[PDB]
Amino acid sequence: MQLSHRPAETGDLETVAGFPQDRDELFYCYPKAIWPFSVAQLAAAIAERRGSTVAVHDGQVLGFANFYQWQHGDFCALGNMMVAPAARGLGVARYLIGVMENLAREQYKARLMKISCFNANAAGLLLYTQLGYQPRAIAERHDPDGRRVALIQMDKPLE
Numbered sequence: 744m745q746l747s748h749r750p751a752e753t754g755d756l757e758t759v760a761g762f763p764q765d766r767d768e769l770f771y772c773y774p775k776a777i778w779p780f781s782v783a784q785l786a787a788a789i790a791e792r793r794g795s796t797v798a799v800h801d802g803q804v805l806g807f808a809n810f811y812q813w814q815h816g817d818f819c820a821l822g823n824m825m826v827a828p829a830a831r832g833l834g835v836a837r838y839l840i841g842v843m844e845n846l847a848r849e850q851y852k853a854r855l856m857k858i859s860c861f862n863a864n865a866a867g868l869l870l871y872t873q874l875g876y877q878p879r880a881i882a883e884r885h886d887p888d889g890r891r892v893a894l895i896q897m898d899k900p901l902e
């Protein structure tokens with residue numbers, strides 16, 4: 744796994760928009776989106792967010808993330824964490840999160856990174872835990888079927 748990163752480009756949209764494999768996955772990484780995902784929805788997120796970044800290995804875009812909140816000197820909140828299905832479990836998210844932590848520190852002088860994870864996303868909860876994030880609160884949300892879900896709000900200090 745020889746990973747690199749760069750800002751997301753328009754030519755990456757179709758690939759990245761293909762990452763969420765079902766309604767549940769889309770909900771976990773972009774709860775405001777509507778299934779099916781599309782390049783227009785991805786581009787709209789990019790435009791209203793900051794720091795949209797891809798991870799690349801062996802000439803393939805395998806991961807994407809951005810910030811949905813950014814507060815200089817304070818914190819950033821990581822969003823839209825998406826990984827290519829073939830590349831899941833291989834360290835892409837772990838890699839990209841480290842890149843995004845550096846970017847929060849360097850660009851925003853953030854002291855903290857926030858990550859919110861829906862309860863059903865065990866893989867996410869476990870990975871963020873491995874990376875040092877701690878749970879702080881649980882908020883009530885609703886899924887696309889109007890069912891109640893628990894949004895676990897986590898954070899991690901950045902020096």
Ligand SMILES: CC(=O)OCC1=C(C(=O)O)N2C(=O)[C@@H](N)[C@H]2SC1
Nearest residue numbers: 771772773774811821822823824859
């Ligand atoms: C790390 C990730 O993929 O988080 C996905 C997410 C987003 C996201 O759209 O990026 N959020 C918001 O927007 C907030 N409601 C939180 S709810 C969780």
